[PDB]
Amino acid sequence: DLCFTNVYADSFVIRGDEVRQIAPGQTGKIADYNYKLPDDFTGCVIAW
Amino acid sequence: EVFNATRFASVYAWNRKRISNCVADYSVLYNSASFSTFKCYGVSPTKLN
Ligand SMILES: CCCCC/C=C\C/C=C\CCCCCCCC(=O)O
Ligand SMILES: *[C@@H]1O[C@H](CO)[C@@H](O)[C@H](O)[C@H]1NC(C)=O
């Protein structure tokens, strides 16, 4: 029941044990050198 | 000697070890170790450095 403004989709592949790293904090190999989310994040994360 | 050891202990006789006089640079674990669970409680991970 909402309408969204500036929708961007980002895509990639990783290893299972690294999925917990896709979150605002979460230091680690993936979050320090490859992909980082901000602290003021509005959106959704999906993995399969 | 802690993470890449040879035999671990039983949960009923769990082992305990002291650590002192050392530099805690954990990025040396990135090349070899892959943890399934990691959770810190009274501290944020982005500040451990
Ligand atoms: C061998 C005992 C070392 C004593 C460490 C004491 C304080 C530092 C606390 C936590 C760092 C441990 C490594 C965190 C796991 C690596 C993942 C990462 O965050 O990149
Ligand atoms: C332990 O030895 C080295 C130390 O980093 C590590 O690369 C290797 O994968 C480990 N071997 C074992 C116990 O599987």
Curated annotation (Swiss-Prot), chain A:
Region (Integrin-binding motif) location: 15-17
Effect of D17N: In strain: Omicron/BA.2, Omicron/BA.2.12.1, Omicron/BA.2.75, Omicron/BA.4, Omicron/BA.5, Omicron/BQ.1.1, Omicron/XBB.1.5, Omicron/EG.5.1; complete loss of interaction with host integrins
Result when mutating K29T: In strain: Gamma/P.1
Top-level taxonomic group: Viruses
Job description of the protein: Attaches the virion to the cell membrane by interacting with host receptor, initiating the infection. The major receptor is host ACE2. When S2/S2' has been cleaved, binding to the receptor triggers direct fusion at the cell membrane. When S2/S2' has not been cleaved, binding to the receptor results in internalization of the virus by endocytosis using host TFRC and GRM2 and leading to fusion of the virion membrane with the host endosomal membrane. Alternatively, may use NRP1/NRP2 and integrin as entry receptors.
Subunit structure and binding partners: Binds to host ACE2. RBD also interacts with the N-linked glycan on 'Asn-90' of ACE2. Cleavage of S generates a polybasic C-terminal sequence on S1 that binds to host Neuropilin-1 (NRP1) and Neuropilin-2 (NRP2) receptors. Interacts with host integrin alpha-5/beta-1 (ITGA5:ITGB1) and with ACE2 in complex with integrin alpha-5/beta-1 (ITGA5:ITGB1). May interact via cytoplasmic c-terminus with M protein. May interact (via N-terminus) with host bilirubin and biliverdin, thereby preventing antibody binding to the SARS-CoV-2 spike NTD via an allosteric mechanism.
Annotated protein name in UniProt: Spike protein S1
Organism whose genome encodes this protein: Severe acute respiratory syndrome coronavirus 2
Biological classification of the source: Viruses, Riboviria, Orthornavirae, Pisuviricota, Pisoniviricetes
Range within the parent protein: 389 to 436 of 1273
